[PDB]
Amino acid sequence: SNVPHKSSLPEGIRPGTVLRIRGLVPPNASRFHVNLLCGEEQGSDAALHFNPRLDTSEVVFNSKEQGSWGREERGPGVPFQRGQPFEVLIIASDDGFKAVVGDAQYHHFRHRLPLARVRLVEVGGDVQLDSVRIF
Numbered sequence: 001s002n003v004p005h006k007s008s009l010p011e012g013i014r015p016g017t018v019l020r021i022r023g024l025v026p027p028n029a030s031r032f033h034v035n036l037l038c039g040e041e042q043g044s045d046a047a048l049h050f051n052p053r054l055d056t057s058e059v060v061f062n063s064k065e066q067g068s069w070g071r072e073e074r075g076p077g078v079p080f081q082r083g084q085p086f087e088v089l090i091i092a093s094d095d096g097f098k099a100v101v102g103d104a105q106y107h108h109f110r111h112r113l114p115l116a117r118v119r120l121v122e123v124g125g126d127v128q129l130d131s132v133r134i135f
Contacts, residue, residue: 004124005132008040013118013134019090021123022130027083030055032125034090036097038117043067047113048097050090052080054126061099063112075099075107085130 013036021034031053037044046064053060059075079101080086089100096110123132 002125002127004122005129006040007121007132007134009119009121009134012116013092015092015094015115017092018135019092019121020131020133020135021088021090022085022132024085024128024130025052025054025080025082026126026128029082029126032127033123034088035122035124036090036118037120037122038113039119044120045113045117047111047115047118048090048109050088050099050109052078054078054080054082059107061107061109065113070112073107073109079104079106 025032031051034050035046036048037046045066049062049064051060057078059078061073061075063070087102091098091100092115096108098108099106121132121134123129
């Protein structure tokens with residue numbers, strides 16, 4: 001069973017915040033996601049949707065605003081593998097979110113929504129989480 005992991009952020013997140021996600025991509029994984037969302041409602045606007053796609057060998061970044069998706073950005077290749085553990089940082093600055101995978105800077109996603117609207121982090125899909133922490 002895939003069960004979403006939710007972290008409420010009722011005072012939001014400010015520049016200089018680190019979301020640290022550790023887990024395993026299980027053997028039959030298709031894709032999983034890390035979403036920074038504006039509210040608890042299903043289909044909430046998203047400042048960031050980070051979506052490793054093992055099935056298509058891509059990592060997609062997008063936002064959702066006023067109920068519509070933005071233009072996808074892609075990182076280089078896919079630094080995740082079925083059957084292997086990973087660590088991702090998502091780091092908030094004034095300018096955007098930096099994604100770090102393993103020991104490497106991976107992608108910068110410029111803010112599209114104001115960072116102050118973020119209220120929730122949801123991690124789900126085909127992933128077995130070790131831990132999620134927000135600093």
